[PDB]
Write a protein that binds this ligand. Sequence first.
Ligand SMILES: Nc1ncnc2c1ncn2[C@@H]1O[C@H](COP(=O)(O)OP(=O)(O)OP(=O)(O)O)[C@@H](O)[C@H]1O
Lengths: 96, 304, 152, 258
Amino acid sequence: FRKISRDRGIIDKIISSMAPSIYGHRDIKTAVACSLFGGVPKNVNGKHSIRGDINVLLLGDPGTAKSQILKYVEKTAHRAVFATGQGASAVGLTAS
Amino acid sequence: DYYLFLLRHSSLYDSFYYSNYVNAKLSLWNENGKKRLHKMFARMGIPLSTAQETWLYMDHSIKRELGIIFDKNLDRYGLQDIIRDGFVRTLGYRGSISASEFVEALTALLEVGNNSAQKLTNLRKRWVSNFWLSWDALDDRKVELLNRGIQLAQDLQRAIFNTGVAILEKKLIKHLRIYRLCVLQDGPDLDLYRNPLTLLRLGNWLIECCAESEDKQLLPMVLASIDENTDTYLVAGLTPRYPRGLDTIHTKKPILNNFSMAFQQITAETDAKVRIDNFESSIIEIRREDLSPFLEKLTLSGLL
Amino acid sequence: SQYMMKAVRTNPMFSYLDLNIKRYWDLLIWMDKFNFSGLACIEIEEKENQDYTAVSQWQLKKFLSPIYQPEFEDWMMIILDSMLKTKQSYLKLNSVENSLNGFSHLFSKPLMKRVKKLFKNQQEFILDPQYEADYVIPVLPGSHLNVKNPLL
Amino acid sequence: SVLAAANPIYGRYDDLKSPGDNIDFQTTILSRFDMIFIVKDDHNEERDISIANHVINIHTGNANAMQNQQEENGSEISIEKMKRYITYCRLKCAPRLSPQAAEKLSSNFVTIRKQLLINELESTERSSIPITIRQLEAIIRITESLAKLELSPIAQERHVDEAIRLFQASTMDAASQDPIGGLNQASGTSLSEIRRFEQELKRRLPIGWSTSYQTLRREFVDTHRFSQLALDKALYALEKHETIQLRHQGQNIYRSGV
Ligand SMILES: Nc1ncnc2c1ncn2[C@@H]1O[C@H](COP(=O)(O)OP(=O)(O)OP(=O)(O)O)[C@@H](O)[C@H]1O
């Protein structure tokens, strides 16, 4: 890891390695990579908390491989949960 | 006793972590040094949970056999030089204090406690005021001030370590032919380095880190720090040091500090807006605009 | 020009106004009335290539150090020449006024080297008391800025 | 005590629509809140730059390196010290009003309750934010709370003025949304009379020179064109930044632009 981390253009290869079999849509891949790696949460003097995670939205025409990208993100992530449409409730995405 | 930072008032892990010699010998600023320290603590037989407890509440059996554990294991990692003898003073049912911890508490009390000419005057007045705070701590009646000094020393060493890792990771040290330059222009808590003692602390950290480096050189170092309020750099010259455990064949009158004569020579010849008024002749205050040309002249000055 | 003058005079609103054309401009750089430069001709003639005079009135130069005031004028005289050359090339060839795209390519490389050399000389001589005559920021009526680095 | 936060319908306040179409809380629940704050964004450049710098200082670590100093010197106190001060004040003091404070509060209640009548009669619809006796008791409570800070045993006019100003900033501002135009039955004739009066005023008065409200009333009303709602028409014309300016203690009406 530390050997390959100092190569120039590691970010480009990481982006190119996201969902390789899907063609194009490089901005979606960049957003997915940024969400996967994530930011850094912060706490200022123990009274002001700042979130450190990135949320992504995909609004597009039918037949553009959005669901396959979601499945790839599910597979790659360490902890992943999947839900769809009317199959989820108020307390099914929350505590009951 | 041992070359450990505040052993009797903090944990064992903290003493090994914030030590100049251990950091120089193991490079704790990155991940490899921390992993090596964890491996050492695992080998020695002390659980990682026990090594993080307070010294008073540490397990009695481990404390009793600390000497044998040090003697038989420290040789593998090159830390056999941390064992020494010192002086410990005890007064009644109070607790033991070593000379080293006392001097660090006094230095911490000196450092922190309690239109630009007035700004500098107020700082110098506060520095004068801290003298009586350090003076009071030498009396046996005032022990709360000594405890406050110990806490201040812990915080100050943490800040020095935090700045040093940033300096070392970004390669801010520039290796010129005659000397090595380090100028701190951006970052947090640059208001702690307006005091000469804190800059000497950071310089002692860096020199200790460089002495144990495999690179063999004895070049003097220059450390510069900005103050936004005064718009002045405080610049200090630091002499190189031989490794602590090196033989006595090189031992002599130590390396001589030649920054005073060079600074006077440059100041006399040019109308630079520099202030050489401290008792230590190796510490000067130079205006922001003059820093980049002045140093160039120093490059051709010589004697360094 | 004659058609515009006749049209303006024809209007009853401006029947009694006196209008006279003083100069014709080929290339004009305008910031305000006290800062301008360019190429102008007093009056156009027939069958002779029009004579053009180059004017440059820059009050902005007065607030510079004495060593850099000649450089300001010298580099403006190169900017104007390059712009004229590229405008002539664009005219000959045939959102953006393509007459003046790419004029900076001709004088960029010399300017970088000149700036580097001037910076080196400034670093060498700024603290020399003998050269204290140079690097002096003038005091003028209406000057307010308090600034440190002359080449900047 | 209850501290509540909520968003309006459609997300943003949508100042184009009526207040009654923006707040879904009924009058029953809105009468139990002493202070109501309606929060909006103004999108000013200077404020945006100031907020951006303030937020970036928080993230880059420059926040703490400042804050401790002020907390040290004289301007801020820690959370625990303020907690102890709050409990000491609440368990030690309970102020009382003065005879002059009651007199100053009664007149303010009468004024703020009169204004609502004119607003409701003009807009010919009931107000969404109500003003009741609870709104008088709220101002009394705020006055006594202000007195509590200084451990004073009596509340005086100094505290009454600040309590009144806070109430004006909080609830009277929310009540007085002042719709520029709703295209409702109220001011129905004004839908054309506004343009009529604007044209009559812009043909009478060229881009220079000024007039007076006295004359613009007497002469334009001798022809029986008065509507009793022309007070805000001048301000609406002023909002165009060209039609009208008011100068000289509001007496002088100046034509400034197209
Ligand atoms: N470059 C591509 N762009 C779009 N679809 C692609 C591409 N390459 C392959 N496909 C295939 O096209 C099909 C359409 O993809 P998919 O079912 O994810 O579409 P969708 O409209 O985004 O789906 P949904 O409505 O479930 O979110 C899939 O079988 C996918 O594997």
